[PDB]
């Protein structure tokens, strides 16, 4: 309705990092096609779906694809899909692989080319390069989403959009200062989208239910969105969240609504998150009882 995108994460297959390659229905668990049809019926056309690169990739990032995972990764995104809306392969991995930087771009790419590879002939699924790189060099940032773009492209996946992500855990409202070199990314399909972050807490790591004020949305992408509009680039919010209360709901109210006038940068939001295994997590947006899904839902209905 009012953006190109607006959905949800939906989060469950990298829970339990710590255990790899983990077990299965013990350590992670896949979305719920069931739930997610409800959240499409709400009128979400989006869903980011979380991975590990190890789970998916064990051992070595240019080896081969492990065939248990990477059959519910599919299933999962066709489920999605086949209702027509988008899905977001997201390897959620901070720029680290076995906790260790990645420093090979080309390493990098023959991972993005050999996933890319399963979806190529889907033009509903979306690539996100990676989730939140941090404290790492920023060329080696920049080099490290060109790879994937380069893997990406060379399987023949030309029609789907990718997802970029900067340095600083990709942050809104530190993107200016610290990503500014990432509009030199190139693409021969010309469909890459800015993903930023943007949590509304005490320090924007999105652990707290509590905003900093009715404002803090807004004030935290003013300056992204207007590096966008001077660049000509377009982004998306990959992720947001905030409790529900008064503040927060406003807070949020505020951010959608000038991330509203601003559609000519701004293609859209994704809440973070929804999901089989987080229970009484303050920003589930799980139905039917999350509390994001029961009480932040309803003043998003607005935008879709």
């Given at each position: 309705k009012v953006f190109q995108w607006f959905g949800s994460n939906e989060s469950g297959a990298e829970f339990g990092s710590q255990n790899l390659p983990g077990v299965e229905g013990k350590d992670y668990i896949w979305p719920d096609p069931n739930t997610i049809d409800t959240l499409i019926s709400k009128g979400m056309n989006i869903f980011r779906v979380p991975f590990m690169m190890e789970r998916l990739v064990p051992n070595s990032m240019t080896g081969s694809p492990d065939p248990n995972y990477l059959a519910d990764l599919i299933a999962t995104v066709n489920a999605i899909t086949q209702k027509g809306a988008y899905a977001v392969v997201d390897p959620h991995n901070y720029g680290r692989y076995y906790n260790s930087i990645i420093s090979s771009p080309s390493d990098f790419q023959t991972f993005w080319k050999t996933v890319a590879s399963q979806f190529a002939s889907n033009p509903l699924v979306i690539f996100d390069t990676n989730n939140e790189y941090h404290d790492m060099d920023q060329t080696l940032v920049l080099n490290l989403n060109q790879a994937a773009i380069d893997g990406i492209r060379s399987a023949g996946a030309t029609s789907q959009y990718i997802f970029v992500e900067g340095n600083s855990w990709t942050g809104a409202w530190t993107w200016t200062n610290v990503n500014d070199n990432m509009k030199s990314l190139?693409?021969?399909?010309?469909?890459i989208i800015y993903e930023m972050h943007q949590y509304l807490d005490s320090d924007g790591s999105g652990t707290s239910a509590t905003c900093?004020?009715?404002?803090?949305?807004?004030?935290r992408i003013?300056?992204?969105?207007?590096w966008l509009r001077a660049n000509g680039k377009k982004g998306i919010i990959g992720e947001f969240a905030g409790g529900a209360n008064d503040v927060c709901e406003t807070a949020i109210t505020g951010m959608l609504d000038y991330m509203a006038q601003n559609t000519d940068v701004w293609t859209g939001a994704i809440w973070w998150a929804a999901g089989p295994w987080w229970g009484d997590y303050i920003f589930s947006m799980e139905p039917?009882?999350?509390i994001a899904y029961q009480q932040i839902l309803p003043i998003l209905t607005p935008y879709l």
């Open positions: 190139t693409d021969p399909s010309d469909k900093v004020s009715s404002t803090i949305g807004q004030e003013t300056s992204a969105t207007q039917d009882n999350g």
